[PDB]
Amino acid sequence: YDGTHCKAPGNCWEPKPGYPDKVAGSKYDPKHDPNELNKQAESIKAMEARNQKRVENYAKTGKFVYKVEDI
Template structure:
């Protein structure tokens, strides 16, 4: 029983050390940019099977929604600066 437990612990330690060695952080493209793609992942995503091919109509909807959010937040901040009290619903 003791031998089985020792073998299991040794196997776990070996597995953990191999995972640590898988990424060494030494192949950075620039300081702070150390992301490495999995083997077989293309350098350029556009045109590959990983290209998400976003629908321009849906992207435009998202941009319009974000713009509206920014406008509402600007009104809220302006009102808070004026009154000294933050109100969520400012019209």
């Protein structure tokens, strides 16, 4: 692995001598829980939705309110 041998443009990764091609099934498998992985995105979606409410409220009344339960 010297970073100069490329399967495609912008994709030059090779496994090192002795290390595997794919990690799934190997001793270095990350074994990620698919639900843990998705948490971020869902937290972002919820944040985006509460912000959307704050903007809607500023547009309706002319007065900014942060707390969504007081809207």
